[PDB]
Design a protein around this ligand. Structure first.
Ligand SMILES: OC[C@H]1O[C@@](CO)(O[C@H]2O[C@H](CO)[C@@H](O)[C@H](O)[C@H]2O)[C@@H](O)[C@@H]1O
Ligand SMILES: OC[C@H]1O[C@@](CO)(O[C@H]2O[C@H](CO)[C@@H](O)[C@H](O)[C@H]2O)[C@@H](O)[C@@H]1O
Ligand SMILES: OC[C@H]1O[C@@](CO)(O[C@H]2O[C@H](CO)[C@@H](O)[C@H](O)[C@H]2O)[C@@H](O)[C@@H]1O
Ligand SMILES: CC(=O)N[C@H]1[C@H]([C@H](O)[C@H](O)CO)O[C@@](O)(C(=O)O)C[C@@H]1O
Ligand SMILES: CC(=O)N[C@H]1[C@H]([C@H](O)[C@H](O)CO)O[C@@](O)(C(=O)O)C[C@@H]1O
Ligand SMILES: CC(=O)N[C@H]1[C@H]([C@H](O)[C@H](O)CO)O[C@@](O)(C(=O)O)C[C@@H]1O
Ligand SMILES: *[C@@H]1O[C@H](CO)[C@@H](O)[C@H](O)[C@H]1NC(C)=O
Ligand SMILES: *[C@@H]1O[C@H](CO)[C@@H](O)[C@H](O)[C@H]1NC(C)=O
Ligand SMILES: *[C@@H]1O[C@H](CO)[C@@H](O)[C@H](O)[C@H]1NC(C)=O
Ligand SMILES: *[P@@](=O)(OCC)N(C)C
Ligand SMILES: *[P@@](=O)(OCC)N(C)C
Ligand SMILES: *[P@@](=O)(OCC)N(C)C
Lengths: 531, 532, 531
């Protein structure tokens, strides 16, 4: 019989699902509202508490995903989903919901550690429904919570002032974590032990939350997978007013004053803003047009509520509250998925120095490398070889390092020197659930660890024994970290702490501790960027 | 002999004087007094909010607009129910939360007369407070009469079944008006400690609902339901109302992604847009082709968790609701003419046969809600008796009437009685002379016929006979006596027995006398039929 | 280094501007919000507090001028501006801003008297940026504040009831005064010594504030230049419902009820309401049509909040807080500017008893002289001579006396009789900053004193030693009145208090005291109207 839980705002009706082999059913709740629908006047405003409901709310349908490019969004979901058959999702501004997967016995009391998942998608696309928590829940006995937050214009439009501070999407994240604090005990979860984990923009969000004093007592463990607050492309630094005006103009709005722009965009229909989004041509590399003026996406800003200053200033401050923090990257973060999604001109699968330099300059919005520094950087990565195929691959290494590797390591080093427990990893494996269009030589591509973390091998078909073992190992590592702030455990290879020796775990076919991850790269880039 | 000026909590009000032959003291009439903030824009589909106070003297001397509704249907119903000589044409507006007051008291003195709050009917779809002139009842029975308005149709009852739009806005408007009466009626010579609510049809159902609602607890002290109660199922929606919510959203040109979105969109539609939507939805009309069970879920009262925590059925068996004297009554031929005529019933031949009756009884599923598997048992119980098709056609009209009003009323009465509260019933059976000429002379005690007696039409309209005038007088005394004592009896009136175990009720007509066990057999039958 | 001040709602960054002759630079702050933008649902409602901002706000740009007839507005600005080159302004509903000019050395404590200026423009047009408080600030060491308030429909639409009482612009003035009371100390001003002054509609506004209880302790001295609460054309008496319905209909709005009208209008876009404004033909003399119907402008009404009764009933009540009040007028109020703007038929520059009587009628909405009284009026002013050219000039002295002269004296007398310090002056000087289109014979035209008050001779060019001397004296008088409630000061010609002797000051090439201003005109008109 359907499980019914009493939340602060009313009763929610879910459903029991069984994962072949597990006796204890998993209680799954789909579409629990954690905030008032940010419609009309509530657009570009902090999320407000959901109004309470009278009888039993039927939480048995996937909620809509926040308004986004329907094509890019369905595509990312089909590439990242860990479940057998992709789920067609609806679009709506009414999207502040979360999904709960709990293996606890609801008729009894339980305090299982809680793992709140924050999806990626450049803060422009994505959804919670993409990730099925059934496997992780069942296999490690933790409560899995997938959340949603406003995207693109809706979640990040900022006039750089009080009329529209920005970071609406991040505040949505804080609102969900807050909802967890007040309701998770009712779902067999321990509000006193909540871990936050996410990848890409999601990992970047986790990073931001770690530094934001607003989220202080809302989590106890943190995991950033392929993405931190130092991932340039996601954090707008400087005057954001121009971008705001460009958006207002594109939406057919005056730019007389900030208030006018905000009032105007609030009067626009969801669809009108969707077209505006499409017009902006986000998440796509611009080939014609000054690379320094291309906005691949809207994102995190220094609003003065969530972030009082840049992520870098906050790091040296040793101010951010310290909690166990696991930071990892993939072997080839920019190996296929991202370049493919942004339409990189690599049709020939080959690159020479002069073209690499032009491409590097074109991708300024992703790597922020001064035009005069291009030769240095390019020469550093491609110069060591004459093979034009290797130059393209090493060129992909270059992008990956500037975007994920160096930023993550630098973030790990700061979290570490702040006295908090730090852990790092480099995932190198090629999941069999990879897209058929992905070249087979690509190993450890962006998002590849997602299949292990969410036990894809137990929901999807075709997993080899090696792949299945990898997933079990990863989920235990994640779940062990969730409960102790340490991934180590019996039956698992030793994962050294990220201390002064900078030891880290290498995950893949063969897993073992290694040291000084990306050490030379961080040295090369910190020095080049200081020039 | 100067216009009367009354000071209320929100500001001063200026009314006018109107004398009625046979009474020295002029009656003070105040028209269009706002008891709530206009439910416009974002306020649409939300509980009524307190009205804003005004600075000087608000002029309450014009009839307020009537809540948006089918203009043609509303006008026709007004002409047929108005107790005034000539019907007053009204305007339409979402800004319709007003009330009218008729006080016979000398406002230059202290007066605390019993107050009667009238709730008009019209299937919660149409209707207006201005249709009813309280001049006569107020002067004749020395009571303050207050006619109220409340959001109708989509505006007052749109419901998504969840928190984004619980529904019953119109009912919340009625509770809001009653609360205004408590804080201000004193200024008009009324006794806030003695408010009687009464209404007929949808108004009676409204009264019936207010009696069972924890929200109205201490806002009235007597209640009267004339031809309509909480069990008149046609007005109460049980089950999932979400599908009907969607059917409305689509007809209006909205998405249905989620309730919050549906509500957001409808809130941004205009009055005229929602008016056109209302017409396309063809409410108050019986569909003859399609599937009956789907034949127009009709807009109405729902179990929202605010006004009503459970079904009226579960609420009566609770003995929980605060008890107050309650008078419940029906007319002889509730479905005699007016309703069928209004709904354009397929009774153009004036002749019906077993077969055709089971069809109509099926197509009229939204009115009576009888399973197609029951139709036969039911139709045979009423139409079998004779072979004269015309007699069947009449027994059929009694069938409908008993299902819609007759039986529900007696059950509601019995339950209220069993809950240890004063109960009184009546069966009005008379043919007013003000009846429309298109009404078959053989119809006496049609729906709404008691209205002309209760509101003293005989003293406003023309040509009334002494017998009719006499009936009105008796009916107003009985009503006013009840308003002031919770008992209709008084000197100069036939004994009205209380509806206790002997189940005595009053038969009101040219020959008013007491009787017993009204619709006793009918109840047993239908109670037994529906019980499957 | 730019000056940064700390206000209740956040920090504001201004700029320094030095004036030849003063070592201490004047700190100027432009566009400081004193209320929340009256957009959307906030239209036709009282102004709400401004929302606090997070970092440092740049008060270095001129704010927009409230929506109004752009051409008519720029024209008035060009005519009245005291700065060398007029500044082009943008139109907007987001116009509730104020500009500050403080000569105080912010590094130390200062409690300089504060002068809050309220521009005129018939409540239909105008702006605060037109007036540069640089000169007055440094020359007389006072803090100068130019405020803005909603105009036309936006600031005065009234349904005559609780749904849209009206007087939004006046409420805006009060909101600005309250802001000064709470923040001015941060700019080196003394909240305990605020003087409000304005001319024309700004003068009527000041006169209104002196009568209203809403502004009870928000000012200490008042100055009404060419405008008071008794200048009939700005105050609406009687049923205002007719006007409201005319605006609603012109905008394409049903008039079913007051609430419906306001709701419908609360949804029209700025542009749509601007078009309705332009169609109404405000600030223009209507020649074709009944004079008793034409509506020259929307304005002050008896709302029951700002004004509880009419200005008249309020004066003969001696209840309004008594403050030093200086009421003044100009020699030829209707000399050129006003007639020109309203497009008066005075094309022939000559007039005869016949035309005059028809004009004094068509101009009903300005003077409110009953058709039956037109004779006695035309005869009392034009009967004297037969020189049609003299008749035209006397016709102008007729309008001016009904609109400013008589009303000003009556107000001043009542203020005196109420027991409060009263002062009066008559400005008679033709500034060199006049427009070429303006006949040279015109002296003391409407708004001519502005150039002396705002030190136009120290910003503009071509000022003679005489004009320069005049402005210095005027500013001292104004500034002295501000700090002492008495204009006198060593070195300045004696200014007699306006008591029973009714002494006043004639300001011009030869500034000297006189007695009983307009005394005879007041007698004539008071009598006539009383019929
Ligand atoms: O995408 C087209 C096609 O290009 C090839 C080379 O022919 O791969 C290049 O482009 C990919 C992005 O879609 C990169 O990930 C890859 O590294 C680059 O060589 C083909 O493999 C691919 O089908
Ligand atoms: O006088 C009107 C005329 O109407 C008819 C046919 O329409 O009456 C039928 O329909 C009425 C309701 O609309 C019923 O009340 C009536 O009983 C039924 O016969 C004619 O019969 C009647 O003469
Ligand atoms: O355009 C009107 C024209 O009239 C003259 C006389 O030739 O002046 C009269 O009309 C002016 C209206 O703009 C008034 O300001 C002026 O006071 C009056 O004498 C011309 O000067 C003017 O161009
Ligand atoms: C029919 C439908 O699709 N809507 C469902 C919604 C949402 O879509 C999600 O389930 C999350 O609320 O949830 C409900 O239970 C609810 O909000 O009361 C109603 C219904 O079950
Ligand atoms: C059309 C309409 O009903 N609105 C009218 C309102 C209110 O409705 C009344 O308060 C109750 O009618 O008041 C007036 O009559 C009035 O005070 O002059 C004006 C308007 O015409
Ligand atoms: C919107 C705009 O571009 N103009 C300026 C506005 C002004 O406040 C208003 O325009 C009033 O003049 O906002 C700033 O002051 C600010 O907050 O940093 C700087 C900005 O340059
Ligand atoms: C699921 O929700 C629907 C409404 O969407 C409701 O009608 C149905 O009864 C629910 N199912 C349950 C609680 O078993
Ligand atoms: C209607 O209101 C107006 C002003 O509010 C007033 O003159 C009039 O007396 C009121 N009612 C009537 C017609 O007496
Ligand atoms: C605020 O002022 C600083 C100069 O001190 C300037 O750099 C900045 O651009 C201003 N803010 C705005 C309008 O961006
Ligand atoms: P990710 O969030 O992009 C980061 C720039 N997306 C590829 C999932
Ligand atoms: P009544 O409100 O209909 C009740 C179903 N109407 C006939 C007045
Ligand atoms: P002023 O505001 O007119 C007042 C009646 N205008 C001439 C500037």
């Amino acid at each position: 019989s359907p499980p019914v839980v009493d939340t602060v705002h009313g009763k929610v009706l879910g459903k029991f699902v069984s994962l072949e082999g597990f006796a204890q059913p998993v209680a799954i709740f789909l579409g629990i509202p954690f905030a008032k629908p940010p419609l009309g006047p509530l657009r570009f405003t902090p999320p407000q508490p959901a109004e309470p409901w009278s009888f039993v709310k039927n939480a048995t349908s996937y909620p809509p995903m926040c308004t986004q490019d329907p094509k890019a969004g369905q595509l990312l979901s089909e590439l990242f989903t860990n479940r057998k058959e992709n789920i067609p999702l609806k679009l709506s501004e009414d999207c502040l919901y979360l999904n709960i997967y709990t293996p606890a016995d609801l008729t009894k009391k339980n305090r299982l550690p809680v793992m709140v998942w924050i999806h990626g998608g450049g803060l422009m696309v994505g959804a919670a429904s993409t990730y099925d928590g059934l496997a992780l829940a069942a296999h490690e006995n933790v409560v899995v919570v997938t959340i949603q937050y406003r995207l693109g214009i809706w979640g990040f439009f900022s006039t750089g002032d009080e009329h529209s501070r920005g970071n609406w999407g991040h505040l949505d994240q804080v609102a969900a974590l807050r909802w967890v604090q007040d309701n998770i005990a009712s779902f067999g979860g321990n509000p006193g032990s909540v871990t936050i984990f996410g990848e890409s923009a999601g990992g970047e969000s986790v990073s931001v939350l770690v530094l934001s004093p607003l989220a202080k007592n809302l989590f106890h463990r943190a995991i950033s997978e392929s993405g931190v607050a130092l991932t340039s492309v996601l954090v707008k630094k400087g005057d954001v007013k121009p971008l705001a005006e460009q958006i207002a103009i594109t939406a057919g709005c005056k730019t007389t004053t900030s208030a006018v722009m905000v009032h105007c965009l609030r009067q626009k229909t969801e669809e009108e803003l969707l077209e505006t989004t499409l017009k902006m041509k986000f998440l796509s590399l611009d080939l014609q047009g000054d690379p320094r003026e291309s906005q691949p996406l809207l994102g995190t800003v220094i609003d003065g509520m969530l972030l009082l200053k840049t992520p870098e200033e906050l790091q040296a401050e040793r101010n951010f509250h310290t909690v166990p923090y696991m930071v990892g990257i993939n072997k080839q973060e920019f190996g296929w998925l991202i370049p493919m999604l942004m339409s990189y001109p690599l049709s020939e699968g080959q690159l020479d120095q002069k073209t690499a330099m032009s491409l590097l300059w074109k991708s300024y919005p992703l790597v922020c490398i001064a035009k005069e520094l291009i030769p240095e950087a390019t020469e550093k990565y491609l110069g060591g070889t004459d093979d034009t195929v290797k130059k393209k691959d090493l060129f992909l290494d270059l992008i990956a390092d500037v975007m994920f590797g160096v930023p993550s390591v630098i973030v790990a080093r700061n979290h570490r020197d702040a006295g908090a427990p730090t852990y790092m990893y480099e995932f190198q494996y090629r999941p069999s659930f990879s897209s058929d269009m992905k070249p087979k030589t690509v190993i450890g591509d962006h998002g590849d660890e997602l299949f292990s973390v969410f036990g894809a091998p137990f929901l999807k078909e075709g997993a080899s024994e090696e792949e299945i073992r990898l997933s079990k190992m990863v989920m235990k590592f994640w779940a062990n970290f969730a409960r102790n702030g340490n991934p180590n455990g019996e039956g698992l290879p030793h994962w050294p702490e990220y201390n002064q020796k900078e030891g880290y775990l290498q995950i893949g076919a063969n897993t073992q501790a290694a040291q000084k991850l990306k050490d030379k790269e961080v040295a090369f880039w910190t020095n080049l960027f200081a020039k």
